[PDB]
């Protein structure tokens, strides 16, 4: 979540105030996945060291 | 013995994988000679200094 600041003014006397509440918003992060894949044989397996 | 890394890839859900197999190669250095020949006399190494 994140958020802005609060607008102040500059008021007289007597005066009423501004409506200054600040606005929000919402950041989002999705997850992705990567992968490799290396075949081998079963003669390779057992003669290469 | 020389050889490179594996290529990965951003696959996403229930997709195939590439074959990724890296690939070898052998680097060979041969010997070789060098020769140099110099000749005297018998006189000589008993006289030259």
Redesign the interface.
Same mark, same amino acid.
């Given at each position: 979540v994140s958020s802005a600041a609060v607008q102040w003014s500059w008021d007289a006397e007597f005066e009423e105030v501004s409506d200054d509440s600040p606005e929000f918003g919402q950041p989002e992060i999705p997850v /992705? /996945?990567?992968?490799?894949?290396?075949?081998?044989s079963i003669e390779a397996l057992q003669d290469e060291a």
């Open positions: /992705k /996945k990567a992968q490799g894949f290396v075949p081998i």
